[PDB]
């Protein structure tokens, strides 16, 4: 890999610089290089990895949605034929997006998840696995769409099971996992009742645990609780 000659610490330092410069593709390549050094990642390093790829794939997904909407309009009644270009360019973006998702899932499988023994790391990585299968599911249309959905579901479910046994209800990783699994139910699995029930129960259990927290931890947890509330307000 092109980062094989760079020190692990230098890769982490440059990932942080790339974040400050809003150069998220560089940031992701630096963190990919750091992961490929073969050592486990610290809490801060896991978050750098997540931030980098979230921004890269987030932009690809936003572009894909723009192009898919144009493509759908072109297929309505009365739309003038414009040739293959819209489909071609949506496919190009889609393929690039799938490639990034495959890269992230490859890092998780070789070998981040299998070495991750603490709840905070294992849940973090399993949530990522669910997220990137969910992004694949958003664009899937063929023989494997159901298997892609079930891969997302399975990763989220394992993360939920660990997080409920090993973390308090206000833990930000647990909360962000529940938020995204609830979005999976609503947006991917055609299960809006499950999405609402999960978001509400997660919110209420966290509310009841806030009294145990410092001011800084309270701020961290309530921020994500507000995201659960925003979704419930949108969905109900």
């Amino acid at each position: 890999g092109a980062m094989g000659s760079m020190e692990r610490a230098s890769l982490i330092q440059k990932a942080k610089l790339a974040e400050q410069a809003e150069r998220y593709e560089d940031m992701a390549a630096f963190m990919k290089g750091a992961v490929e050094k073969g050592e486990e990642l610290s809490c801060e390093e896991r978050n750098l990895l997540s931030v980098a790829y979230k921004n890269v794939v987030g932009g690809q997904r936003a572009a894909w949605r723009v192009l898919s909407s144009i493509e759908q309009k072109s297929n309505e009644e009365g739309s003038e034929e414009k040739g293959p270009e819209v489909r071609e360019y949506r496919e190009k973006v889609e393929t690039e997006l799938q490639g990034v998702c495959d890269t992230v899932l490859g890092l998780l499988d070789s070998h981040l998840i299998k070495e991750a023994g603490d709840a905070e790391s294992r849940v973090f990585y399993l949530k990522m696995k669910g997220d990137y299968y969910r992004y694949l599911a958003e664009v899937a249309t063929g023989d494997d769409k159901k298997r892609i959905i079930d891969s997302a579901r399975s990763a989220y479910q394992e993360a939920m099971d660990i997080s409920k046994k090993e973390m308090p209800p206000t833990n930000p990783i647990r909360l962000g996992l529940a938020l995204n699994f609830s979005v999976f139910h609503y947006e991917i699995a055609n299960s809006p009742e499950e999405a609402i029930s999960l978001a509400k129960t997660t919110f209420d259990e966290a509310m009841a645990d806030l009294h145990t927290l410092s001011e800084d931890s309270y701020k961290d947890s309530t921020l994500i609780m507000q995201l659960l509330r925003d979704n419930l307000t949108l969905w109900t």
Partner: peptide
């Protein structure tokens, strides 16, 4: 590049 529009985190 991540938008702010999505329901996820």
């Amino acid at each position: 590049e991540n938008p702010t529009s999505q329901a996820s985190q």
